Design an enzyme around this catalytic site. Structure first.
Site, PDB file in Angstrom:
ATOM      1  N   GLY A  18      21.574  17.540  50.794  1.00 16.27           N
ATOM      2  CA  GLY A  18      21.957  17.038  49.471  1.00 16.27           C
ATOM      3  C   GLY A  18      23.306  17.581  49.046  1.00 16.27           C
ATOM      4  N   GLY A  53      22.652  21.638  48.546  1.00 12.22           N
ATOM      5  CA  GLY A  53      21.690  22.264  49.434  1.00 12.22           C
ATOM      6  C   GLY A  53      20.942  21.272  50.292  1.00 12.22           C
ATOM      7  CB  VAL A  57      14.573  18.867  51.498  1.00 17.38           C
ATOM      8  CG1 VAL A  57      13.087  18.977  51.216  1.00 17.38           C
ATOM      9  CG2 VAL A  57      15.293  18.341  50.255  1.00 17.38           C
ATOM     10  CG  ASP A  96      19.595   8.606  40.736  1.00 16.35           C
ATOM     11  OD1 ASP A  96      20.487   7.730  40.629  1.00 16.35           O
ATOM     12  OD2 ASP A  96      19.602   9.473  41.645  1.00 16.35           O
TER      13      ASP A  96
END
Ligand SMILES: CCCn1c(CNc2cccc(C(=O)NCc3c(F)cccc3F)c2)nnc1-c1ccncn1
Lengths: 613, 338, 61
Positions: free
Chosen positions: A172, A175, A177, A289
């Protein structure tokens, strides 16, 4: 090491006071916690034969609540009434009101069997469980066990050592996942691990902040259709979110592989997304979003709404800024200085669902950078509906894509219920969408360090009671209860043959007792009394102490990276104390400080006891 | 003012009472005793140490057998000791931590104690089912128990910060007689040898004498300038000694109705906490907050010896009925026998 | 304090009407008592060490 280890039953003394000071030793508060319920349940079923029938009746109603069809409910309502109502009445054993008996019977004779038929009986069961029975519960082992379990919870300090990391899932803006198992229970989670360096560089500290706050506003009520959070914590270098795991990739990814979806397959995804949006909107959060990239799939193909980083809290202060991806935003959203609420997602949903059916946003005609023309088509183009579409699908999209909020589906009126009532969704049973019973259309394949800025990230750590207690209940709870019952049984049989200490706390005026440690560390068992703090090694009585009179003050301090109490003693002397847990620490501080301030208030009144010149 | 019209009347009696006494004051005990030989350096030593209590000791009392004694401590325990061997006979954990006093019944069958619980609790030392159990809690006072003494197994007298004393029927658990008059907390009481009378001493700095049976104050003795902490009967039943925060002990005579003697020194600067006479009455032992116990010639007012064995306040002492030994209790947590 | 002066008066009424004795007589008797019991006061008149529980006594019942 890795296993969950419960403190000993003696922790009750400290823990009961902790909870009682916080209002948490009540029937409501304990009964409605998962582990409180399970332990209250055992106590009633096994150790008091006057509350057995009540909890049995209760659990039988709760099974009844969840029965899918009206016919299953005719049959079961009659079984309940026979066993728990008529028989008890004939046995003279029925502690319930005339109006309760008549409400159910009056309905049952007319064959009307709604899921909430037994609600008056639920409230009267609680009434009969809430007094003496509840008090007897507190007086028993099962509340001792509740305390042991509650102790572990309120002492949770998560690190990386506590998890086990498998492989990456995505990347992302700040950072990434990851896939992780949690060591003690084995429950599989997703770990999002954003970096503080990159956050302060992009200056998106307000963003990470928003997500953690929006997540906790969302992660209660065990919703199946949003990726929810179970924990949050910090390290020297990064911020963790422990989230619900989804391995199946996103609908953006799958749209590209599969191609556009049928009217029938979009429907299923729509159903699930609508229940996600209903969840957030009932907690005053607009997602903003909603797009296919942001919807995730699990190993069976059921879906969840994922990234919360752009979501907003519209309860108090309503948003007006344009935020979201361009081909899904609402007219209100784009308009400068215009308030909007949840209405945004309902428009985006209409955009998002059209993309599943047609491969692009309604308002984009392959334009890449050019957000403007997308926005201008949003504000003028009533979207052209191919003849391919059904008239049911047509009116749904035409309803959701109304330009005015005054008209739109899910806006003026009753929210998600207006959507759910469309002819497009008329085949659906919404109970069954929620319970995830409809078969998914796609099963995914099986093969600049700053000391100043740190304090922005205090109040980041968090554990969601409801989330942690479910993790425990579904994994280790029964086996640890069995084990630590067996531990204790042998502790009793050991002490009974090794001259058991007929407890030194009983029959006096002891305020509190429990283990602590003290350097001159040394683990000793302490008894706090109104005028002194005794303590002892094992296999003897207390043979040394400290008096409430000679205690000048009690403070928290830090030793070898640990939090410990410091008592300044009369002779310019010091005393240092470690506790096992944050609750213990907090409660000794309060009780010691309470006791010495009251003891020293007393001694001054007594001429024989106080000091003289 | 009806209250004026009986206030000066309170004076014309308080003067009449000074008068009758001043008339009786023809000589002084020191003048009468000026002839008899001194007692000579009484150099007692410590013969036993009793270790066991974990915090301050507040009170002790000898059994009539001149062998067992009870002590009572900040550590919330009575301990009954055997002084001859040093062994403990019973270690009694109490319900309230805040005990201040303790007592031993003449029979040896019971002990009593109390403190800020405002209760005098009686402990059966020989339960038919061979155990030590609370056998009565005497409730009634509205202030702290400061001292108590059994007349016998069914009767006890108790002093209190509510300013009263009281005789109790232990069985009925009631105040059989109340003794009001004091205007300050009562600290101590001594029972006359014939247990027909008893004296009390209070923070009003006065000592009273009471008729056990009739429940009245017969005589009120003044002279101290501060709290009376300890009080003790002279063996013949006709006099008594007191110890005060004023740094003095004093001797009072019943029939003379006044003070005979004051025991003090310019070095001795802190209050007395405890007093008693030796068997003949010739010696008056007093305990001090300076950590010593001073031995006074009762008759001549000379300091005869000191007992320096404690590292904090000497809080209590007693002399054995057989006159063989003295017991000192201390804030340092030890008792010593001398 | 209405009936506080009342009972304070009549208490003194009692305290005043006892027949007192001269101090010389009181001190005389105090002195007499001590003297008559000096032999029997072990803190003044030592007993044999073997009779004293706290020095040299061996046999106890
Ligand atoms: C397959 C990963 C999809 N995913 C994302 C996507 N978003 C994401 C993933 C990793 C880091 C960041 C990040 O740095 N976000 C900061 C941020 C905001 F918080 C708000 C707006 C923009 C932005 F960059 C954002 N977030 N969580 C997941 C995810 C994946 C699998 N299971 C559960 N959740």
């Amino acid at each position: 090491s890795k296993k969950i280890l419960l403190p000993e039953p003696s922790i009750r003394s400290v823990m009961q006071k902790y909870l009682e000071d916080r209002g948490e030793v009540t029937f409501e508060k304990i009964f409605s916690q998962k582990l409180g319920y399970l332990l209250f349940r055992d106590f009633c079923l096994k150790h008091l034969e006057e509350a057995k029938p009540l909890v049995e009746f209760y659990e039988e109603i709760k099974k009844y609540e969840k029965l899918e069809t009206e016919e299953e409910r005719l049959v079961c309502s009659r079984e309940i009434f026979d066993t728990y109502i008529m028989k008890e009445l004939l046995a003279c054993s029925h502690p319930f009101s005339k109006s309760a008996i008549e409400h159910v019977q009056g309905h049952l004779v007319k064959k009307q069997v709604p899921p909430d038929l037994f609600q008056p009986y639920i409230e009267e069961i609680c009434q009969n469980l809430r007094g003496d029975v509840f008090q007897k519960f507190i007086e028993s082992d099962k509340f001792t066990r509740f305390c042991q379990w509650k102790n572990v919870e309120l002492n949770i300090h998560l690190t990386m050592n506590d998890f086990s990391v498998h492989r990456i899932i995505g990347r992302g803006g700040f950072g990434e996942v990851y896939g992780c198992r949690k060591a003690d229970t084995g429950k599989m989670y997703a770990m999002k691990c954003l970096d503080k360096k990159r956050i302060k560089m992009k200056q998106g500290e307000t963003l990470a902040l928003n997500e953690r706050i929006m997540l906790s506003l969302v992660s209660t009520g065990d919703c199946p259709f949003i990726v929810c959070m179970s924990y949050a914590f910090h390290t020297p270098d990064k911020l963790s979110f422990i989230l619900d795991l989804m391995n199946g990739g996103d609908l953006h990814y799958h749209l590209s592989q599969h191609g556009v979806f049928s009217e029938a397959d979009m429907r299923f995804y729509a159903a699930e997304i609508i229940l996600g949006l209903e969840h957030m909107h009932n907690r005053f959060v607009v997602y903003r979003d909603l797009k296919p990239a942001n919807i995730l799939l699990d190993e069976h193909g059921h879906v969840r709404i994922s990234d919360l980083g752009l979501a907003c809290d519209f309860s108090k202060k309503k948003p007006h800024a344009s935020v979201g991806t361009h081909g899904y935003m609402a007219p209100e959203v784009l308009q400068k200085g215009v308030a909007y609420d949840s209405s945004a997602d309902w428009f985006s949903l209409g955009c998002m669902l059209f993309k599943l059916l047609r491969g692009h946003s309604p308002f984009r005609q392959h334009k890449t950078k050019d957000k403007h023309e997308i926005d201008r088509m949003t504000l003028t183009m009533a979207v052209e509906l191919p003849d391919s579409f059904s008239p049911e699908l047509r009116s749904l999209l035409e309803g959701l894509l109304q330009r005015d909020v005054n008209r739109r589906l899910g806006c003026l009126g009753r929210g998600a219920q207006e959507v759910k009532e469309s002819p497009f969704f008329r085949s659906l049973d919404w109970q069954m969408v929620f319970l995830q019973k409809y078969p998914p259309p796609l099963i995914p394949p099986r093969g600049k360090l700053l000391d100043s800025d740190q304090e922005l990230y205090r109040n980041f750590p968090l554990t969601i009671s409801e989330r942690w207690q479910q993790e425990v209940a579904e994994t280790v709870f029964d086996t640890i209860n069995a084990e630590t019952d067996r531990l204790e049984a042998r502790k009793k049989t050991k002490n009974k043959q090794l001259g058991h200490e007929e407890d030194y706390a009983l029959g006096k005026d002891c305020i509190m007792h429990g283990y602590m440690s003290k350097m001159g560390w040394q683990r000793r068992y302490f008894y706090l009394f109104p005028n002194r703090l005794e303590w002892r090694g094992e296999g003897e009585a207390p043979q040394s102490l400290l008096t409430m009179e000679e205690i000048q003050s009690v403070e928290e301090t830090q030793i070898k990276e640990r939090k410990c109490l410091l008592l300044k003693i009369r002779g310019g002397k010091q005393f240092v104390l470690q506790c096992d847990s944050d609750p213990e620490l907090v409660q000794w501080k309060k009780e010691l400080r309470d006791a010495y301030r009251e003891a020293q208030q007393l001694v001054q009144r007594v001429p024989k006891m106080k000091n003289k010149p | 003012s009806e209250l004026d019209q009986l206030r000066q009347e309170a004076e014309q009696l308080k003067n009449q009472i000074r008068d009758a006494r001043k008339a009786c004051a023809d000589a002084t005990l020191s003048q009468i005793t000026n002839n008899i030989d001194p007692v000579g350096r009484i150099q007692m030593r410590t013969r036993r140490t009793l270790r066991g209590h974990l915090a301050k000791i507040y009170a002790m009392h000898w059994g009539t057998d001149s062998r067992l004694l009870v002590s009572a401590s900040q550590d919330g325990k009575l301990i009954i000791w055997d002084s001859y061997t040093t062994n403990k006979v019973h270690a009694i954990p109490l319900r309230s931590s805040w005990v201040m006093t303790c007592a031993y019944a003449p029979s040896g069958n019971y002990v009593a104690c109390g403190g800020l619980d405002n209760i005098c609790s009686i402990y059966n030392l020989k339960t038919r089912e061979g155990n030590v159990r609370v056998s009565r809690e005497l409730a009634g006072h509205t202030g702290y128990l400061s001292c108590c003494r059994f007349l016998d197994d069914n009767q006890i007298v108790t002093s209190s910060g509510d300013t009263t004393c009281a005789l109790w029927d232990i069985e009925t658990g009631q105040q059989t007689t109340t003794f009001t008059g004091h205007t300050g907390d009562v600290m101590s009481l001594s029972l006359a040898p014939d247990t027909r009378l008893f004296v009390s001493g209070a923070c009003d700095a006065s000592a009273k004498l009471w008729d056990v049976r009739e429940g009245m104050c017969r005589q009120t003795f003044t002279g101290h300038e501060s709290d009376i902490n300890a009080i003790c009967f002279f063996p013949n039943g006709n006099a008594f000694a007191t110890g005060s925060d004023d740094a003095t002990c004093r001797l009072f005579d019943l029939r003379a109705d006044q003070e005979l003697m004051t025991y003090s020194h310019d070095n001795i600067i802190c209050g007395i906490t405890s007093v008693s006479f030796s068997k003949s009455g010739r010696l008056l032992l007093a305990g001090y907050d300076d950590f010593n116990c001073n031995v006074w010639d009762a008759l001549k007012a000379d300091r005869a010896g000191v007992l320096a064995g404690h590292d904090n306040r000497v809080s209590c002492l007693g002399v054995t009925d057989d006159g063989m030994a003295v017991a000192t209790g201390s804030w340092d947590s030890f008792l010593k026998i001398w | 304090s209405i009936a506080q002066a009342r009972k304070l008066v009549e208490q003194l009424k009692m305290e005043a009407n006892i027949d007192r004795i001269k101090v010389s007589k009181a001190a005389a008797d105090l002195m007499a008592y001590c003297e008559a019991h000096a032999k029997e006061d072990p803190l003044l008149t030592p007993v044999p060490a073997s009779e004293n529980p706290f020095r040299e006594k061996k046999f106890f019942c």
